[PDB]
RNA sequence: CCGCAGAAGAAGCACCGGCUAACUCCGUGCCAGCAGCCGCGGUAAUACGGAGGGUGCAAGCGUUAAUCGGAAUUACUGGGCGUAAAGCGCACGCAGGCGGUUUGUUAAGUCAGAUGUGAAAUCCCCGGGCUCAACCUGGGAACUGCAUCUGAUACUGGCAA
RNA sequence: GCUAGUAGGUGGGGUAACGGCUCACCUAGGCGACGAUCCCUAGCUGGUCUGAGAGGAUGACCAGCCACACUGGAACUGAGA
């Protein structure tokens, strides 16, 4: 039985870079789709395709650099077991001044950056950079 | 580990206990004197070390270090305690500052006087 | 490409069959003033050539870091050995703020304004393991930028 | 608002007094997360109109007998 | 104390030259630097990190005349200006009234200038000033007294200043010996006293 | 009943009063309602030694405030 | 604030084996004694005692007690638990904690704004007043909060399907 | 494990007012490991100190609150003890 769906994503991303696949599999869900979206825009994953028509899986395409991976900061800020929310002006910027955290808010799923002056704060789900 | 365990069973931070107790909780102590002995030290470091017990006036029977050279100490002498300890002597957790109260300082000391009280000479 | 320094310095021993050697081995660093700076273990049975030989093996090493304006842009979190290594970015008003091995290696690589920390064992021989953990682990403006190049 | 707490009964062994049990999410700033801290309270009731395990609405109000200062406004449901 | 102890001897114990009690006639001619302060002052030790930080601190510390306690007060004022507090720190040491007056050529030396500040010789505006820990304000009026230019000390104290660089953040005057603190000291107005790295290490402990 | 009054909190050999609304049944430097500015007699026009709040007081006086010799006459030193 | 002679009346304390900045010489010789810790000392003592010299602080310095830090050294931030301290001997399971996924709803959690409220002082930012600073002080911010009001619906929780 | 004015319901009385505050009767509950009750310790807070923060320790002077006034106890007066 799963306790974190979201881990299933992140775990297999870092693993999978390491494993030298080019796209990895794990069960989708609505939120998960929308997390893979910010990564993708910002560039953190190559692209993504969702086969739901039979049984949902988020087939997310791995981006590589050249041979070196692009994972170095992947960790989940939040947990199911430590659900967290950080306000508009008490949201930390993560790792580096170049950092990127996927952050959910009341509008949508966004990012540290975007979410900020978007008048919002909310759950920082994770970060990749 | 996990938070919810701690929510029940809070983490400690200290136990609130000194390395060296003071047994009066202050800078300085009035203690009497019970026996002017000179024992040989704990650990082999072969010497004669001037110690003395001393019944403090607020209670507690404790043992204090005697330093410098010379003495004036008596079995009903009443001393000012420096506090703090030295290694190589076991039941000593306490030290006597001479040259304070009735007790005299070091006879013929002309450097590092503050340690073991004694006034600077006129010169 | 030079800017001589030494760091640590100490002795080590093997038991010959009953006699003992007491070889003086040690860490150094030679700068370049922009990074590409290493480390060496200069064994010497005597004391002077103990840093001689170290500065040799320094030339036989390098770890390139990219950094600008004396301030490494990327905080350090990295852990190798039981030495935890840290560096929080400080734009200004901090020197090096260090008494570690990680004082000297974070200066010679051109580094005039950083603020630093470590937890773990104080053991200077692997305080130099900040070199995996801040030199080779780095994140540069152009580094992330070529993720975005894609 | 009349300080309205959606609570759940846990005691009809008296008439006009029903012990309702409610919680707020209490946070520790040192365990750094919310938890359920449930606090029984002593409400003053019209007679009885509920069983136990009865989800209800209660409100603050005057005191009017020992440890009373909440009232029943209505019984939401017996079971959800 | 205020120090005011055996001056130059510290220049000896650091091996680095300073005008503090020297002339412009004696530059270690008929005086000596570093030959051996003490009977062990000839031979040089390598020094631990803390070694460097202590020595170097004392370098900066003695060409303003500044004490420990004083220096901490400066450190919490530095880190209480928004700026680079390396700069802010050494800016405030060259904010001491005794120093700006010397650096406008009215003191023979850094130290002798403060002998002036003792007496009622120095002033800012019409206001008399005897305190040297006074951080002068942007655009000041830091004049000598009327009845202090008549003294033979003050005439002879424009003399020894002559022929120095006089790092400009301020005006150097001889009609009314009245300057202006017209911008602050800066990183460029250091004259190779760039040792801001050391003391900010020392202090942060 | 509130009582507007002075209250010196300034360092030795240098009065710095503080015109405050308190009540007369409590300490001069103690318990206060809210301020209504300051009075410094050491001002001589290199800084302003007062803060008026004319408006605030004008409401307070109707609310049953009482004015002491100093405070009353100090509105007078600045008139309107 | 003015005048008055005349350097006049105004420097010490601790430490210097290593940690830790700062060495020599004698006296003594596991004796004397030192001692925050590691440890010194049994005859050229860089560690004792005295002296010479020096180093750092300074009208205070040192010593002690005591708090916090350093110490991520009991770890929310910020830990381990195969052998170093450290997985109940092993299962089941109530309470408690946690909850796959889809639609809808609610908006309690949560986010936002709104409104009260968070005393003053203390604190903090800029800026004044005491010859300067200490101190005192003005306005503003903070006042980590709390509640309510009105909004938001991605997640979290509740209900339904 | 604890709790008989103990916990609640009726109806009197009392208090400036609500209230076992107190009283008569009636019910047999109420409270507790989400830590009651009991024991040790301690004035409590703003805050203070330290600290990078988070946190910890602490609560002297300055401010607010509570209690206490030789020890114990009690009421009277009065707007208020």
From Swiss-Prot, chain A:
> What's this protein's family per the entry?
Belongs to the universal ribosomal protein uS8 family.
**GO function terms (MF aspect):** rRNA binding; structural constituent of ribosome
Q: Which organism is it from?
A: Escherichia coli (strain K12)
A UniProt-annotated Pfam family: Ribosomal_S8
Q: What is this protein called?
A: Small ribosomal subunit protein uS8
Per the entry, what this protein does is:
One of the primary rRNA binding proteins, it binds directly to 16S rRNA central domain where it helps coordinate assembly of the platform of the 30S subunit.
| HAMAP family, per database record | Ribosomal_uS8_B
**What are the protein's UniProt keywords?**
Repressor, Ribonucleoprotein, Ribosomal protein, RNA-binding, rRNA-binding, Translation regulation
How does this protein assemble? Part of the 30S ribosomal subunit. Contacts proteins S5 and S12.
Q: Which GO terms describe its cellular component?
A: cytoplasm; cytosol; cytosolic small ribosomal subunit
Q: Which InterPro entries match?
A: Ribosomal_uS8 (IPR000630), Ribosomal_uS8_CS (IPR047863), Ribosomal_uS8_sf (IPR035987)
**What GO biological process term is on the record, naming one?**
ribosomal small subunit assembly
From Swiss-Prot, chain C:
Query: Which Gene3D superfamilies does the entry link to?
Result: 3.30.160.20, 3.30.230.10
Q: What SUPFAM superfamilies does its record include?
A: dsRNA-binding domain-like, Ribosomal protein S5 domain 2-like
Subunit relationships = Part of the 30S ribosomal subunit. Contacts proteins uS4 and uS8. With proteins uS4 and uS5 encircles the mRNA as it enters the ribosome, which may play a role in mRNA helicase processivity. Can be cross-linked to mRNA. In collided ribosomes contacts ribosome rescue factor SmrB.
Result of altering residue 12 to E? In strain: SPCR7; spectinomycin resistant. Not a ram mutation
Name of the protein in its database record: Small ribosomal subunit protein uS5
Q: Which organism is it from?
A: Escherichia coli (strain K12)
InterPro entries reported for this sequence: Ribosomal_Su5_D2-typ_SF, Ribosomal_uS5, Ribosomal_uS5_bac-type, Ribosomal_uS5_C, Ribosomal_uS5_N, Ribosomal_uS5_N_CS, Ribsml_uS5_D2-typ_fold_subgr
Kindly list the GO molecular function terms attached to this UniProt entry: rRNA binding; structural constituent of ribosome
What else does UniProt say about it? Altered uS5 proteins have been identified in a number of mutants. Some mutations in uS5 have been shown to increase translational error frequencies. Some mutants in this protein can partially suppress an alanyl-tRNA synthetase mutant.
From Swiss-Prot, chain E:
Pfam families for this protein: Ribosomal_S4 (PF00163), S4 (PF01479)
Q: What does this protein do?
A: One of two assembly initiator proteins for the 30S subunit, it binds directly to 16S rRNA where it nucleates assembly of the body of the 30S subunit.
Q: Where is the S4 RNA-binding domain?
A: 95-155
> What species is given as this protein's source?
Escherichia coli (strain K12)
Q: Look up keyword Nuclease and say if it applies.
A: no
Record protein name field: Small ribosomal subunit protein uS4
Describe its assembly. Answer: Part of the 30S ribosomal subunit. Contacts protein S5. With proteins S3 and S5 encircles the mRNA as it enters the ribosome, which may play a role in mRNA helicase processivity. Some nascent polypeptide chains are able to cross-link to this protein in situ. The rRNA transcription and antitermination complex (rrnTAC) consists of RNAP, NusA, NusB, NusE (rpsJ), NusG, SubB, ribosomal protein S4, DNA and precursor rRNA; S4 is more flexible than other subunits.
Quote the InterPro entries the UniProt record gives.
Ribosomal_uS4, Ribosomal_uS4_bac-type, Ribosomal_uS4_CS, Ribosomal_uS4_N, S4_RNA-bd, S4_RNA-bd_sf
The UniProt keyword set, sorted, is:
Antibiotic resistance, Repressor, Ribonucleoprotein, Ribosomal protein, Ribosome biogenesis, RNA-binding, rRNA-binding, Transcription, Transcription antitermination, Transcription regulation, Transcription termination, Translation regulation
Pull one GO CC term from this UniProt entry: cytosol
A GO molecular-function annotation:
mRNA 5'-UTR binding
Q: Which residues form a coiled coil?
A: none
Swiss-Prot record, chain F:
Q: Which PROSITE patterns match?
A: RIBOSOMAL_S16 (PS00732)
Pfam families annotated for this entry? Ribosomal_S16 (PF00886)
Explain what induces or represses this protein's expression: Part of the rpsP-rimM-trmD-rplS operon.
Keywords tagged on the record: Endonuclease, Hydrolase, Nuclease, Ribonucleoprotein, Ribosomal protein
Give GO MF terms, alphabetically: DNA endonuclease activity; four-way junction DNA binding; structural constituent of ribosome
InterPro entries linked to this entry: Ribosomal_bS16, Ribosomal_bS16_CS, Ribosomal_bS16_dom_sf
| Stated family | Belongs to the bacterial ribosomal protein bS16 family.
Report the protein's function: In addition to being a ribosomal protein, S16 also has a cation-dependent endonuclease activity. In-frame fusions with the ribosome maturation factor rimM suppress mutations in the latter (probably due to increased rimM expression) and are found in translationally active 70S ribosomes.
Subunit structure and binding partners: Part of the 30S ribosomal subunit.
Record protein name field: Small ribosomal subunit protein bS16
